[PDB]
Amino acid sequence: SMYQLEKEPIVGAETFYVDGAANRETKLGKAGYVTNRGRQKVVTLTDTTNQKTELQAIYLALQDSGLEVNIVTDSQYALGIITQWIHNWKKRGWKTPVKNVDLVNQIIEQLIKKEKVYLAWVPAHKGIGGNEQVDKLVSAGIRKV
């Protein structure tokens, strides 16, 4: 394709644990990351959805990272929509998604500027690790954990 994500993590590269949370009643949310080299960022968002905050967190990781990046998301949708866009691009019977088109397009913009990207899904879980840390940061004031 016009790109292909890595099949396994990029050894040596900084890892961004991304997450977003939104509250449906208010459309308020947060998106951000923590990294294994001690970086972290959280942004507040309005007029948003959980899916958009998860994509926004990936966007921030691509914006703030170097040429090779590992990204761990707990959003099956964010992973799928991005992967399908990559694999199905400038190809035959693919039709652009309806929702979140602008944001996914901006993510794709960032992605083609990278040299290597590993994007993996994990389920949300308990513990003290990376997904847990960023979840708590974006959930504060948005949802009870």
Ligand X SMILES: CCOC(=O)c1ccc([N+](=O)[O-])s1
CA gap 2, 90 in Å, rounded: 8
135 near Mn ion, judged by CB under 5 A: yes
Instruction: Count Cα atoms within 13 angstroms, Cβ side, for 37.
Output: 10
Q: Which residues lie across from 44 on neighbouring strands?
A: 30
In terms of residues, how long is the chain? 145
Instruction: Name the residue nearer to Zn ion (CB basis): 68 or 139.
Output: 68
CB of 90 to Mn ion, least distance (A): 30
The token pair at 121 is 């899904």
Q: What is the pattern of x (binds ligand X, CB under 6 A) and - over residues 1-30?
A: ------------------x-x---------
74 near ligand X, judged by CB under 6 A: yes
132 near ligand X, judged by CB under 6 A: no
CA gap 42, 15 in Å, rounded: 16
CB of 37 to Zn ion, least distance (A): 16
- Binding residues for Mn ion, rule: CB under 5 A, are 19, 74, 124, 135
